[PDB]
Design a protein around this ligand. Sequence first.
Ligand SMILES: O[C@@H]1[C@@H](O)[C@H](O[C@@H]2CO[C@@H](O[C@@H]3CO[C@@H](O[C@@H]4CO[C@@H](O)[C@H](O)[C@H]4O)[C@H](O)[C@H]3O)[C@H](O)[C@H]2O)OC[C@H]1O
Ligand code: CA
Length: 161
Amino acid sequence: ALFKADFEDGNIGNWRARGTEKLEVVSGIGHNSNRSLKTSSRSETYHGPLVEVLPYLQKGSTVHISFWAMYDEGPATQVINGSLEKEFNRDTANLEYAMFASTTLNKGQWKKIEADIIVPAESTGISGLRMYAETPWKQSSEVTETDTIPFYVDDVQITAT
Ligand SMILES: O[C@@H]1[C@@H](O)[C@H](O[C@@H]2CO[C@@H](O[C@@H]3CO[C@@H](O[C@@H]4CO[C@@H](O)[C@H](O)[C@H]4O)[C@H](O)[C@H]3O)[C@H](O)[C@H]2O)OC[C@H]1O
Ligand SMILES: [Ca+2]
């Protein structure tokens, strides 16, 4: 148990948007609970809730990340991805991204996204590693309504292996 977010305290914490989207801890919508993190006002596939997690982890280790996600408007099914944003040498202009997991969700039902991930070693110069959720990438030219639907995440956990 290295990191846990259940949002039951109502606090956004260090969770942030990636662009112009809106994040809000809502009540009355949750995974077997009353609170969760809603992301809305998405206008890119890459808009989604993100949190910095490097400080919780040991560089050079393997950890297990999971979370639950739900959407309740738009298409009948939609893919949601779990991804990592990585910063090296404190160079904010040259960020990297990787999908670590993907599942197809049915409208209105909660489902788990999970995978092992590798935390790069110290000698890489890694300086940020942030987990986030999104829909499949993208492209601004081609982004649609179904791609940018609002969605909920809950019960985010990272664990040792
Ligand atoms: O292996 C490939 C993967 O690397 C790739 O991952 C996608 C890479 O693009 C990601 O979208 C990025 C997200 O960051 C945006 O920058 C923001 C916009 O400017 C400011 O508002 C803000 O400060 C920045 O954070 C960037 O514009 C956008 O392109 C996407 O989420 C990843 O899924 O996927 C394809 C694989 O082949
Ligand atoms: Ca919750």
